[PDB]
Structure formats: C-alpha cells, structure tokens
Amino acid sequence: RNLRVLLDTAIPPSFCDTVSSVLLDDFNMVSLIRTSPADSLATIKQDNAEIDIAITIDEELKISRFNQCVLGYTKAFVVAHPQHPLCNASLHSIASLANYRQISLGSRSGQHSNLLRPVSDKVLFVENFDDMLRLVEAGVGWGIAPHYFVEERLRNGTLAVLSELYEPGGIDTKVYCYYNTALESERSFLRFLESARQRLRELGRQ
C-alpha cells in the first residue's frame, strides 16, 4: 500500500524520476530517501527504518527480509584534476592508479563492499560526491563518480577522465532493486518492475 523508497546518489535524476512516477502510479503513498551508495544497503538492513524498496548499485546477496533483482544500469567515471600526474600519462593500469591517493566514499571503519573498496593504500574518505569532487578538483587525488555528476565539469575541462581505455564511455554498473519480500506477491510491485524496466530501457537508448 504505502512505500518508503531509497535511491542511492549514483542513480541519475532521470532514472530517479522514472522510478518515482512508476511507483506513484502503481502504489498509493510514496516516500523517498537518498543516501550515498556506501550507506544504501547499510540503511535498509536496520530493522528500525521501514524501507520497502531500495535501489542502489551496491551488491549484496542474501540480505534478511529483502530480495534482489536488476532494474537497469548506470555509468561511472574515474576522474582526476586535468594537471594531475595521471593525466599526463595516457597509459592506464590499476597499479598506476594505486600509487596515488584515492578519494573514496564510505567510512574507513566498517565492511566496505567490494564495490566501494578503495583500490589504493593511500585513501581519503568522504561522505558524498560534492566533497569528493572538491578534493579531486583541488588535485588532492582521484576518484570514482557517476556520469551525471561530472558531465558538467568534463564538458568544461574542469576535470579529466582516467577510465577511457578500461571501459570507453565509462564503467557500466548494475542498479539493483532490493525489494521487501512481502512485495514479491503484490501485482502492484510486479507491474512497477515491468514498467520501470521498460521505461529505463527506452531511456538508456537515448
């Protein structure tokens, strides 16, 4: 009937709004929460919070009271400041990157998903992407960010990309939809999945 829905901050706005309208058509009351992917799963697991659907890039199989399925995809970029050493290098390996400071989401204390697990031994953590980019643009290091976030800075030369040999066009990242088990049998939920997936496909095409 009613729904509390979490969407992590790597899910682009177009994607969010898509999920929003589908859920508002197929459900009654809809509430949204936004969190960094580092805190996405960590949030829903709290028995205290009552989140019924959670849409995030963070991977985790067997979570209590929740299912998993794939809703769509999003693309992320390895970015650094344009005069950063790694940009004047052209060549790319994960070791070349590991010898420099990563600016990464998450808190050092705690189980870091293999997704947000820093690659460098020299890391500097942040709470959100705004802060991450503050440091990157100040040449303090390099980071991983959503496309929608850094599109602007890349258009404007503010910011470079280090991932264009690894995966041209950025790094495809699954978007998982962890759904409370009680919804498995709700035809409203199944309709939502169907419609949101179709729309997101038509959108990814564009």
Ligand X SMILES: FC(F)(F)c1cc(NCc2cnc(-c3ccc(Oc4ccccc4)cc3)s2)ccn1
Residue with smallest beta-carbon separation from ligand X: 76
Long-range contact set of residues 165-171: C-beta below 8 Å, sequence gap at least 24: 165/91, 165/92, 166/78, 166/92, 169/75, 170/75, 170/76, 170/77, 171/75, 171/76, 171/77, 171/78, 171/144
Cα separation, 190 vs 184, whole angstroms = 8
Contact positions with ligand X (CB under 6 A) in 158-177: 162-163, 165-166, 171, 173
Distance CA 192, CA 19 (A): 8
Contact between 144 and ligand X per CB under 6 A? yes
- Which residue lies nearer to ligand X by CB, 35 or 173? 173
- Residue 126's Cβ-side half-sphere holds a number of Cα atoms within 13 Å equal to 19
Amino acid at 108: R
Binding residues among 26-85 for ligand X as defined by CB under 6 A = 37, 57, 76, 78
- Does residue 116 touch ligand X according to CB under 6 A? yes
The CB-of-151 to ligand X minimum distance in angstroms stands at 13
Name the minimum Å distance from CB 97 to ligand X: 5
**Residue 106 binds to ligand X (criterion: CB under 6 A):** no
Residue 124 or 171: the one with the smaller Cβ distance to ligand X is 171
In the complex, least distance from residue 125 CB atom to ligand X, rounded to whole angstroms? 13
CA distances to 80, 114, 127, 139, 145 from 133, rounded to whole Å, are 9, 22, 11, 10, 8
Considering only 44-52, 144-152, 175-183, 186-194, which stretch makes contact with ligand X by CB under 6 A?
144-152
Give me the phi and psi of 17, to 5 degrees please: -55, -40
**Shortest reach from residue 39's CB to ligand X, in Å:** 12
Taking the complex as a whole, how short is the minimal distance between the CB of residue 172 and ligand X, in angstroms?
9
Interaction site with ligand X (CB under 6 A): 10, 37, 57, 76, 78, 92-94, 97, 115-116, 119, 144-146, 162-163, 165-166, 171, 173
